[PDB]
Design an enzyme around this catalytic site. Structure first.
Site, PDB file in Angstrom:
ATOM      1  N   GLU B 729       0.736  -1.289   0.147  1.00 17.43           N
ATOM      2  CA  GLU B 729       0.068  -0.202  -0.117  1.00 17.43           C
ATOM      3  C   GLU B 729       0.707   1.189   0.248  1.00 17.43           C
ATOM      4  N   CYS B 763      -2.035   8.877   4.317  1.00 20.42           N
ATOM      5  CA  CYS B 763      -2.286   8.091   3.178  1.00 20.42           C
ATOM      6  C   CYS B 763      -3.398   8.932   2.405  1.00 20.42           C
ATOM      7  CB  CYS B 763      -1.868   6.411   2.676  1.00 20.42           C
ATOM      8  SG  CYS B 763       0.045   5.758   3.160  1.00 20.42           S
TER       9      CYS B 763
END
Ligand SMILES: *[C]/[C]=[C]/N1=C2[C]=C([C])C([C])=[C]C2=N([C][C]([O])[C]([O])[C]([O])[C]OP([O])(=O)OP([O])(=O)O[C][C]2O[C](N3[C]=NC4=C3N=[C]N=C4[N])[C]([O])[C]2[O])C2=C1C(=O)[N]C(=O)[N]2
Ligand SMILES: C[C@@]1(S(=O)(=O)O)CC(=O)c2ccccc2C1=O
Ligand SMILES: C[C@@]1(S(=O)(=O)O)CC(=O)c2ccccc2C1=O
Lengths: 979, 973
Positions: B729, B763
């Site tokens: 990720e 993020c």
């Protein structure tokens, strides 16, 4: 009227029995106690019957002891009626088997048959044998009948004929020949198969003829028994041909099975045939011995079930066909073969009412069962012949299990009469009345969104004359289509290049099938650009609409099934059955993935909080490169391409060079379905020119590859780099090699193991990622397994796949032939050659069917994938070593085990960690949905084609979350956590 | 009781024997009538009225009408002509509830109401207060109003009463009476900063209250949502004590709150203790649907009764208590319900309460006959009279319409069996409770539910953080070892971990693993693997459940560590731990679901079972920004699926990493299944990723590092059993689109939080806000003004909005990006930061940004927000899609068309509509994306565990000797 006479006839019959039960239903006896409990408790029935099946292979004290514990538990948990325990079980089981067998030797059989004569019984003698798996075994079987006939020849002159009403005092009942034998046709030819219809008829006929000649020499009777549906037409043709060779000899019979829907027509055709040729015949009518088998087989292949499925339908068919035979007593002698008192009574009253001469009909039962029925027949009917098998107790045990199954079936007349205390009136009822009542009652899986559920497409069925005739016709038609040039197909248009590669017939390389254009990097770039330009509108196409194109392509292929199959026979050397199965699998992928996308295409609400809606759904990636193998040139190509397409990706497709015409079938099928331009692009090309270019290209988001480990690993490495302009991390779907083993345990049924191993190793010349290339055989069964495997291999023929008589043929191309031959030579230096077949002289990429023994895990041919007809045989000292050896390679694709040990099977399920493990059958031939296919280790990346996890690999998930509350108010949704 | 009830019932009948929205002759009556019959239409109509004031051009209005109501044909009959029909009608409906748009108009209309016999309490309509300047405008509007009232009231005749002062209303009530909404006085009102919120609100309320007292007027402090109830009570208590002799100060209490029985008792006891007088306006409550939704979303106890009759019973019960205490507590009955009103009147009479101790209040514009009747029967009626701008007047209209047309509304039901309507709500309660008295889990476990979020309405939760932060400070200075094969292993290489808001504060020392120790951990994991793989999935899942319960018991302690080690704010810290707990609970259940082999196919004579196998050793490389949640998610996922883990925490959150060791240890996880190996990446990073015994790598971090790992791991080394599975990720460059018709009262604080929550170190953080041309200037002014009100400083102090970034490295890199952005665009805001030590980066907002710019493309991972001006909605979508990332995205819009286009085309892994684009919860928002943001795996969702396993099929031929068992799902005959 007649019915009322039949009932009263049966009533007197039950009266004459005096309540006597057959031994199997005698609860005072051990076998009776065992069957009683089996009939009460289905798990025990399964344990007991499977134990009796494995029993003859339990040849050492440890094997026997362990299997007893594994099948029945510890001594305390067994039923009361159940090393001392070894002795009591062994003795009772052996006693049950001897009940159904007249002897173990010819001499003993003859002595016992003469005993039976003094008791008033005639006989038909049968030779017990394991399945015939070789020419030598067929010769042994043949010679046993010849031995039997010679013994009977010396004895029959001294036999007084059984008492009759009239006729000839030297003959039984004044008319029947004293020597009567029955032969199983498939025991005369180990490769009997309607795929090679003529070859099978001839092989069987030649041996049957030798037996028949000696039967005629002593004025005897020969009956040709009927086996399973697969061989029924072959067997009828054998009977017809033998009968015509000896048109004047009256003592030749055939069995017909009333449980077959075919039987009304088969009986009518046979009587008409006899009339036409001015011959007479004899028919033994039975209901049928393989009911559960035929139903299961037809359901596994989506064939019409060939048997009636309500038991009364078989009874009604029996009485119907018996009457037809009796009405035709002039040309047809009749043997009633049933233990059912209603059936027997029906036959007696019909013959009386038709005034049939007694020399035109007799009654038959199996030796050792329905004892009071047998004695009742003797009293009321006079003429009764016992079917009397003799020989080895090993096949004797398999026969026993089948007798126990028949006696204890829920639908069994014997069980109903002697176990269940059924009402006599219901037992003797006209079965036609029974049929209507159960049919009426029986008039009392689902698919989704208007589509029927998924089912695998029906397999080619060579019992059918039309399927047998279809292949030579379509192969001939293909031969009128040769010599064409196949262009690239990019963005809905044909693009021609000037680099052409011929594609040829590997069984006859001088036969050029066509010329294939090769894409350079320019054209591959254009294909990628076209796919990329088509992607946005295709991604935005509703998933149900995308699925519809797959359904249309499936229908297009279904209409061309034999045609598409014929191309594979010639282009890549598929055998008829292998080619058709490739096309049906391609169709299966289309139907299955269409349904999967419909299932996956609906966004799902996730979570249950109110004031909020989260929807989880999937999106495609972009352009997919599909690099397909030659070994399943339509199935696997269509599988990978249709999966990528249905999920909303656009495809650039490189078929393997040597199966480029099959790859063109994808263009034809998708074009016929009306797939939008650019969604599918066909760009065969030289890997040395455009291989890395395609894999490395920045606009590729997904690569589906099936092929060798070296190439797959290389692609995985290169595809991991992210290039300038590259939008996604490339998703790799990569199926690579296998070095697959089948384990043959001590207690394996070798009648099953041997042919399944031969097919797993050598089907399609061994050119399957799933093929068995290592057979690991337990020490104590090694010598006998090998003898039979090798002897069966020797019977097979290697040659052109267009001739259905050949078991396997040439390998894919000259490069494969050379690579495989080098591996065979390496292997013959590591181990020792056990078999190396002849191959045809002249052109063709032939590699001998090759079996090499003495192989150990340290050896190259125990480790390296050969992809050809080279089988390594490995001798394991014990089951622990067998498992360890199975797990000794870097691959984990398929595996097999033949074993009837619950503990060994459990160990294998847990520890034999291949992607697809098969128990007691071949390890090849995976079907969509039933066996999703693929492994890990060096065999792949854990993707399983044809399964419910597969389509997700071609997509990525997305979630949309909405706050539905405005001004302090949110709508209530159905699945909300609320108040 | 039956006697009193009978009098109440009779009084109710008096009222009935003695309403525009229910008048089906008028347009609003027809529209409302159809709303009450057709729920799809109700939703469309009310949402349209909500968005209506933003429809400021002919194009916006025309298109919104068509999108909400369809083609002018499929519309119901009663409805550019269509443009002006709606406009005049909606404006007319809004005017019915407002006494004027200006102070001058209001005062004149208020004076007319007096001559008609009505008293008033005046309220100032406003949009949400989002800045200090807005709080000042609101405040000064009350001061302006009071000034205008001060000059008029001497001229007013007191409403007639029975005795007393004829210069006072009814002889006793102050003529000037105003109500103030406390949260409108402070844009950052939040019980997380309880004291700061009370003080900020109190200071403005005191300024208003002083002017009220100068006029001898009455001030009512209104009560808002449950979030601020405790703050508002404390403001009332403080102001009351500052002016303990001044009797004309009121507070609103809400009978729909389960808390109210105790809150009323507490307040009365408080007033007696302090020997002061109070006034309570009792209402049922205005935020019912909101409180219920909010509580369910956060797994909190729903604070309101959920059967409507329970609120009615509470009201009569609590009104009785107030009237019993009439000596100390003045009462304002505030209800439009005739049963409720009649109950109060007969109770007042039963308890012989003097009339100067109670009055009746209704909202201006509704319950006219009730108001007509009340005046005749009760005589003392005050209208709650709001005035101001038509824009917030429209939002108020929506809420009035919602109340009037609710199924449970006394008004709707009255406009009907009178005996049922006038029934004692206590009887209704027992009946309804009885009728109700007459989501499931699996395998004995409860169904999954997200862990309850920290709840700062509670005194104990507010007290827990300073206390646990102090306790953590008594445990500093430790040396943290490796944990390998169930043993602590010390090394000589130590790296200090410090407090980013105060780097001189060293929390401890972390041992670093060399390649030898990393190799030992891999070897231990490999040795543990066979027995762990062979462990029953239900048993593996039990360890996760034990770990989750161990964490649950340490929630505040675990949260406090994160406040200090990585600079998490209190809420951010607690959420990180609850998410860790959620992963454990959710993945435990997922493995149980996936752990049973399933039969596949239906052919008889055959059994195919499809099931999953683990891979082997997993390397887990965890980030610092969600140091417990993401670490525990990745590690527990690998572990529960039957793999063994070698875990590398980020260097600067290694103590949080150690928490994983404590939790799995407390759970009794077998040795070698989890190994803790912090280390220097330059020493052992590649060694770990390259090792041939590694079969899976789970990584969360930068694109650059993640891409390097993907590339290296795609090599198969000698002795490597598997192709390595990558779970990576990576970053996001996430945009929120602000459409022309966005609700800015929502869009502004959500964008601010999305961008600057936890210093923008997510993020999922908003780093681009893409704002439509026509609303740009307006949105940006409000966003910048709200930003200005926030303070940057240590995360341990809840008065601060954001604080120091992660470390020295991050501060340097983020500041370079800030300078780059300032040359690319123009600075719109740049906050002060504290002087002295700490890794402070200003809260920074930069405008003039276009997709070509570096700060429109590169992930900064810090408090730097790029503002981009889109010419139309199509360009907004194009710009949102113009980066190489696709992690999260947001859109504020009330256009069905634009929302539908966004759902289709704004292709991020997690798109959020009308809320912040951060804060993904397990199961509800499985998190992750593709493109350069990741490889398409979504943690916290139903596809995730399969990434840690590979499927196997076992196929058995069940036929022997011509027989096969019939199995349940067989295709048979
Ligand atoms: C080698 C061979 C031989 N074979 C024979 C011969 C003889 C002399 C005899 C007697 C016999 C035989 N086989 C066998 C037969 O088939 C049998 O046995 C029978 O089938 C029996 O029957 P019965 O006895 O009559 O009895 P019951 O109980 O009545 O019956 C039974 C039957 O039925 C049927 N099923 C069942 N189930 C069902 C049915 N159907 C329909 N549905 C249902 N569900 C069956 O069939 C049974 O069985 C024989 C022979 C030959 O050759 N081949 C054959 O196939 N078989
Ligand atoms: C297939 C059968 S079996 O009884 O089921 O084993 C049919 C049969 O009636 C028979 C009789 C005597 C010897 C062998 C057989 C079979 O092979
Ligand atoms: C929150 C409320 S609203 O009516 O629901 O908007 C509460 C209320 O009854 C009120 C009354 C007069 C002016 C504003 C309000 C509100 O803001």
């Amino acid at each position: 009227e007649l019915n009322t006479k039949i009932v009263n006839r049966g009533k007197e019959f039950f009266g004459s029995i005096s309540g006597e039960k057959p031994s199997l239903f005698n609860k005072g006896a051990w076998m009776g106690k065992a069957m009683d409990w089996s009939m009460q408790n289905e798990q025990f029935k399964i344990q007991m019957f499977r134990f009796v099946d494995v029993f003859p292979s339990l040849t050492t004290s440890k094997l026997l002891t362990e299997h007893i514990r594994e099948y029945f538990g510890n001594e305390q948990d067994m039923p009361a009626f159940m090393a001392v325990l070894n002795k009591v079980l062994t003795s009772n089981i052996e006693e049950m088997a001897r009940q159904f067998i007249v002897g173990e030797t010819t001499k003993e059989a003859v002595k016992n048959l003469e005993k039976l004569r003094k008791d008033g019984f005639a006989a038909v003698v049968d030779v017990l044998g394991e399945a015939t798996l070789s020419e030598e075994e067929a010769e042994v079987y043949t010679n046993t009948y010849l031995e039997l006939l010679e013994a009977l020849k010396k004895e029959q002159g001294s036999w007084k004929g059984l008492p009759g009403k009239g006729g000839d005092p030297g003959l039984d009942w004044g008319h029947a020949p004293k020597v009567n034998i029955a032969v199983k046709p498939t025991a005369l030819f180990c490769l009997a198969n309607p795929q090679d219809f003529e070859g099978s008829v001839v092989a069987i006929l030649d041996r049957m003829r030798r037996i028949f000649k000696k039967v005629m020499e002593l004025n005897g009777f020969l009956c040709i028994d009927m086996e399973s549906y697969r061989h029924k037409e072959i067997i009828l043709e054998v009977f017809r041909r033998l009968k015509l060779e000896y048109r004047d000899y009256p003592h030749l019979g055939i069995v017909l099975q009333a449980y077959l829907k075919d039987n009304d027509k088969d009986l009518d055709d046979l009587l008409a045939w006899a009339k036409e040729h001015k011959v007479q015949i004899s028919v033994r009518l039975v209901k049928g011995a393989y009911w559960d088998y035929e139903t299961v087989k037809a359901k596994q292949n989506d064939w019409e079930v060939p048997v009636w499925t309500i038991k009364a339908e078989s009874d009604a068919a029996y009485e119907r066909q018996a009457r037809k035979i009796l009405e035709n007593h002039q040309i047809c002698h009749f043997a009633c073969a049933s233990h059912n008192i209603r059936t027997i009574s029906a036959v007696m009253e019909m013959a009386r009412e038709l005034n049939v001469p007694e020399d035109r009909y007799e009654f038959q039962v199996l030796y050792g069962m329905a004892e009071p029925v047998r004695k009742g027949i003797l009293k009321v009917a006079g003429r009764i012949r016992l079917y009397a098998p003799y020989g080895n107790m090993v096949p004797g045990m398999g026969y026993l299990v089948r007798r126990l199954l028949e006696n204890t079936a829920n639908e069994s007349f014997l069980r109903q009469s002697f176990a269940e205390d059924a009402q006599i009136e219901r037992l003797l009822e006209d079965p036609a009345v029974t049929v209507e009542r159960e049919r009426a009652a029986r008039a009392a899986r689902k698919g989704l969104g208007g589509l029927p559920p998924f089912n695998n497409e029906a397999m080619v069925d060579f019992t059918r004359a039309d399927h047998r005739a279809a292949f030579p016709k379509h192969i001939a038609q293909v031969r009128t289509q040769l010599g064409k040039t196949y262009p690239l197909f990019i963005n809905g248009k044909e693009v021609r290049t000037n680099d052409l590669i011929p594609t040829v017939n590997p069984n006859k390389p001088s036969e050029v099938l066509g010329q294939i254009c090769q894409a350079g990097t320019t054209e591959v770039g254009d294909a990628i650009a076209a796919a990329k330009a088509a992607f946005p509108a295709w991604r935005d196409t509703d998933p149900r609409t995308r699925a519809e194109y797959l359904l249309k392509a499936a229908q297009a292929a279904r209409k061309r099934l034999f045609e598409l199959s014929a191309w594979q026979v010639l282009e890549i050397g598929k055998q008829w059955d292998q080619a058709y199965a490739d096309v049906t699998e391609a169709i299966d992928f289309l139907e299955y993935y269409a349904r999967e996308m419909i299932r996956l295409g609906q966004p799902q609400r996730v979570g249950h909080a109110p004031g909020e809606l989260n929807h989880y759904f999937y999106e495609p990636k972009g352009v997919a490169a599909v690099i397909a193998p030659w070994n399943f040139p339509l199935a696997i190509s269509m599988g990978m391409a249709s999966a990528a397409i249905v999920t909303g990706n656009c495809v650039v497709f490189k078929p393997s060079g040597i199966t480029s015409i099959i790859g063109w079938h994808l263009v034809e099928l998708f074009r016929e379905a009306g797939l939008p331009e650019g969604v599918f692009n066909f760009t065969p090309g030289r890997g040395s020119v455009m291989g890395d270019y395609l894999v490395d290209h920045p606009d590729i988001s997904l690569i589906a590859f099936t092929g060798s480990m070296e190439t797959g690993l290389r692609i995985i490495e290169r595809a991991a780099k992210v290039h300038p302009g590259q939008a996604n991390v490339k998703k790799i779907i990569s199926e690579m090699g296998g070095k697959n083993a089948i384990i043959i345990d001590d207690d394996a049924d070798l009648d099953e193991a041997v042919p399944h191993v031969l097919y797993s190793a050598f089907g399609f010349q061994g050119q399957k990622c799933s093929a068995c290339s290592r057979v690991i055989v337990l020490d104590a069964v090694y010598d006998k397994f090998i003898e039979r495997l090798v002897s069966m291999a020797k019977a097979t023929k290697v040659g052109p796949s267009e001739d259905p008589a050949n078991y396997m043929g040439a390998v894919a191309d000259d490069k494969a032939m050379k690579s495989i031959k080098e591996y065979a030579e390496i292997g013959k230096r590591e181990g020792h050659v056990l078999y190396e077949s002849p191959v045809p002289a002249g052109e063709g990429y032939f590699v001998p069917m090759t079996i090499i023994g003495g192989i150990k895990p340290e050896h190259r041919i125990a480790q390296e994938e050969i992809f050809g007809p080279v089988l390594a045989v490995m001798r394991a000292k014990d089951f622990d070593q067998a498992i360890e050896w199975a797990n000794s390679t870097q691959f984990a694709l398929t595996g097999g085990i033949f074993s009837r040990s619950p503990e060994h099977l459990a160990k294998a399920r847990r520890e034999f960690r291949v992607g697809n493990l098969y128990i007691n059958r071949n390890n090849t031939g995976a079907l969509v949905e039933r066996q999703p296919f693929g492994g890990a280790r060096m065999s792949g990346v854990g993707t399983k084609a044809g399964g419910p996890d597969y389509l997700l690999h071609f997509m990525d998930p997305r979630v949309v979350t909405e706050n539905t509350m405005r001004r302090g108010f949110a709508p209530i949704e159905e699945d909300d956590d609320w108040v």
